[PDB]
């Protein structure tokens, strides 16, 4: 059993209401989950406003952006779930603000609020395809220069569709449709028996 300190669960819950009241407009759900982490969920339009309040509020200074990520729940209408994890060196706490973005409904960029996001937002576009308005220079960071398709999307094949080899005839590296010599063995692992939720 982990050493939970209820002292935290309460204080972070209380801040979650604080933020919910301060910004009734964009906060949809706030919840301090077990594991004692607070996640304020905001409408995509509240990206700029909710972050700024956290970066510049005396009672909630959240100066650095730990991470910007986008889980992809294909079932969810709004496929991506942009998650921003922020740290507060003054109150030694962490909060996560998560929004929802569909493939062709872009989110605002927070490079203004935190310049850390300049790179992570490019990372989210390259892997998942979400677009960030007002971004200084959005362009693929991790994928190859000519890569077609957004890789971390759940609908993208792991091996992908193209692989590279050197061809003598043309004396230059050349893509070809992927041909694998031992396909990824897809072990089915889920057990047909559940675990009675505690």
């Amino acid at each position: 059993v982990r050493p939970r300190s209820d002292v935290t669960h309460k204080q972070l819950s209380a801040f979650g209401e604080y933020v919910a009241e301060i910004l009734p407009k964009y906060v949809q759900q706030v919840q301090v989950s077990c594991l004692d982490e607070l996640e304020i969920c905001i409408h995509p339009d509240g990206v700029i406003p909710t972050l700024t309040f956290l970066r510049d509020h005396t009672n909630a200074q959240f100066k650095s952006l730990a991470d910007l990520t986008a889980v992809d729940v294909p079932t969810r209408q709004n496929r991506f779930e942009i998650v921003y994890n922020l740290l507060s060196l003054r109150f030694n706490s962490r909060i996560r603000v998560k929004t929802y973005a569909d493939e062709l409904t872009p989110i605002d960029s927070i490079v203004s609020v935190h310049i850390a996001a300049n790179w992570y937002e490019r990372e989210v576009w390259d892997m998942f395809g979400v677009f960030f308005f007002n971004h200084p220079d959005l362009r693929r960071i991790l994928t190859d220069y000519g890569f077609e398709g957004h890789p971390f999307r759940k609908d993208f094949p792991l091996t992908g569709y193209v692989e590279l080899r050197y061809d003598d005839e043309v004396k230059r590296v050349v893509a070809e449709p992927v041909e694998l010599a031992q396909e990824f063995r897809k072990f089915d692992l889920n057990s047909p028996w559940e675990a009675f939720p505690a």
Binding site: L104, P106, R139, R140, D144, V174, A175
Partner: protein, 114 residues
């Protein structure tokens, strides 16, 4: 229906942007074939540009067209500044790969699953 717009409010405005990109690429094809010493013909390349710009001619929705050129503009910026090299440009031409026939009889003669 009822969808928030990305860059243009209507296909019309969007098409304006496509025109600009076409021009951009059209003006650029020659330079690339020279700064990358590619073994292709400017005319040939310019047709390729046309190919791509039409491969996606069917799109009717304004939002889809806007992101397509968003992608398109970054493509030429890497094409320019020679970030893409000869190998990443020539890939567009699918030069090494053997073309596959689409004739039924052809496929029957070769692949189990067409």
């Amino acid at each position: 229906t009822s969808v928030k717009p990305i860059f243009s409010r209507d296909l019309n405005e969007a098409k304006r942007r496509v025109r600009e990109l076409y021009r951009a690429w059209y003006r650029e094809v020659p330079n690339t074939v020279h700064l990358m010493q590619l073994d292709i013909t400017v005319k040939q390349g310019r047709d390729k540009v046309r190919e791509m710009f039409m491969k996606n001619a069917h799109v009717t929705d304004p939002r889809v067209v806007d992101l397509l050129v968003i992608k398109g503009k970054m493509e030429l910026q890497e094409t320019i500044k020679v970030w893409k090299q000869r190998t990443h440009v020539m890939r567009f031409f699918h030069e090494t790969e053997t073309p596959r026939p689409k004739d039924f009889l052809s496929k029957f003669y070769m692949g189990h699953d067409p």
